[PDB]
Amino acid sequence: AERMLATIMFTDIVGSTQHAAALGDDRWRDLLDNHDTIVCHEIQRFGGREVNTAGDGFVATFTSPSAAIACADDIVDAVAALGIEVRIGIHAGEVEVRDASHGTDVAGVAVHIGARVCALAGPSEVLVSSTVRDIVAGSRHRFAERGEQELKGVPGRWRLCVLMRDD
Amino acid sequence: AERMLATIMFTDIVGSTQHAAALGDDRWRDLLDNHDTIVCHEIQRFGGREVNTAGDGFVATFTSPSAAIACADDIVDAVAALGIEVRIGIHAGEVEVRDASHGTDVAGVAVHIGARVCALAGPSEVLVSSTVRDIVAGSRHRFAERGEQELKGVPGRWRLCVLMRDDATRTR
């Protein structure tokens, strides 16, 4: 039950429901194994830790916010290989951490904000909270700042920033 | 990873944020423990199974839809005895159930729907989807039409219904 500052990355497959319906269980399970293997390797690669969820998408923490951004950037291109797109949100805040041997669980308002940012992210986009932009002030990363808004179900007003990618 | 038709109940503490900051961590952690015990004893009494342990809200599946409704109805009252209120959403749909020995997880559109129904419910209110109302057609449970939300980010039209409890119920 540790209070900690963490960078959390949330990812989700765009149109998972329709891919599963168009491909059928057999082919969908395949794509989902390809996606997971890919995403899990990328996370390991950049030093992240998968933190528990039962909800199809991925959630992982990183001791480095720069690592989280670079990891997200790479995941978007890597999964594109499978013909699907992914949406990604990154946020940093204090969260309650609990690391069992069954995995690590993370909770708190910061976790809800992260999931919210992910939902507001477009296909193949890496959307970040201004908190994360601020944290990596000075890094090589560039952002386009969208307007301020309230993430309903959360205290305060948030400005969201899109990562300037390359392609 | 089997595909099934299940009834899912979602619960959540109203104003947990302000309540936690107001009490401090020790006291809050204690109130949550009592909440969890009560909610859990209730789910067990009605034959439910806790699922997706991540997050501090409660999610449970029931073989019997009427039992999930009766359980929500009881949890609302039982929690009040602690000075807090909960909002509960209930939906039924086809989901992907995966059984590991570290707990059971559920996934699917149905699960998103349920989580959404809960978020829309008010304090001490049990909100369900039209599907749940139709499934228990002819039971003692009564519902009031609460309108038709769109539940975005997921397919469908979707009509919500509030459970008529032995207490003031919204939608009139």
Q: Do the beta carbons of residue A12 and residue A86 sit within 8 Å?
A: yes
Angle at A145 between CA A142 and CA A150, to 5 degrees: 140
Q: Is the Cβ pair B29, A1 closer than 8 Å?
A: yes
Q: Do the beta carbons of residue A110 and residue A5 sit within 8 Å?
A: no
Question: What number of C-beta contacts closer than 8 Å exist between A and B?
Answer: 31
Q: Is the sign of the CA dihedral A157, B31, B55, B129 positive or negative?
A: negative
CB-nearest to B17 from A25, A55, A155 is A155
Per-residue tokens: B96: 């992907």
Q: Is the Cβ pair A107, B17 closer than 8 Å?
A: no
Q: What per-residue string of b and e applies to B13-47 under the rule 16 or more CB within 10 Å gives b?
A: bbebeebbeeeeeeeeeebbeebeebbeebbeebe
DSSP one-letter code for A155: S
CA dihedral B147, B153, B157, B158 (to 10 degrees): -50
Report the residue count for chain A.
167
Q: Is the Cβ pair B107, A1 closer than 8 Å?
A: no
What span, in angstroms and rounded, lies between the C-alpha atoms of B133 and B18? Answer: 33
Q: Known binder of ligand: residue B15?
A: yes
Pairing of strands A158-163, B143-145: unpaired
A1-167, superfamily in CATH? Nucleotide cyclase, GGDEF domain (3.30.70.1230)
**How was this entry determined?**
X-ray
Q: Is the Cβ pair A54, B56 closer than 8 Å?
A: no
CB-nearest to A54 from B17, B107, B154 is B107
Q: Do the beta carbons of residue A29 and residue A119 sit within 8 Å?
A: no
CB-nearest to B107 from A56, A111, A153 is A56
Pairing of strands A58-62, A49-50: antiparallel
The domain over range B1-172 is classified in CATH as 3.30.465.10: no
Binding site members of A for Mn(2+): 12-13, 16, 56
Q: Is the Cβ pair B17, A119 closer than 8 Å?
A: no
Count the helices and strands in chain A (H runs, E runs).
4, 8
Q: Do the beta carbons of residue A84 and residue A35 sit within 8 Å?
A: yes
Q: Is the Cβ pair A54, B52 closer than 8 Å?
A: yes
What span, in angstroms and rounded, lies between the C-alpha atoms of B83 and B31? Answer: 9
Q: Do the beta carbons of residue A104 and residue A96 sit within 8 Å?
A: no
Residues of B in Cβ contact (< 8 Å) with A54: 51-54, 105-107
Per-residue tokens: B58: 């409660």
* End-to-end Cα spacing for chain B: 43
What span, in angstroms and rounded, lies between the C-alpha atoms of A63 and A67? Answer: 8
Longest CA span, chain B: 47
Angstroms from B107 CA to nearest CA on chain A: 6
State the DSSP H helix or E strand holding residue A130, giving kind and residue range, or none if neither.
helix A130-135
Per-residue tokens: B120: 């829309």
CA dihedral B87, B90, B96, B101 (to 10 degrees): 50
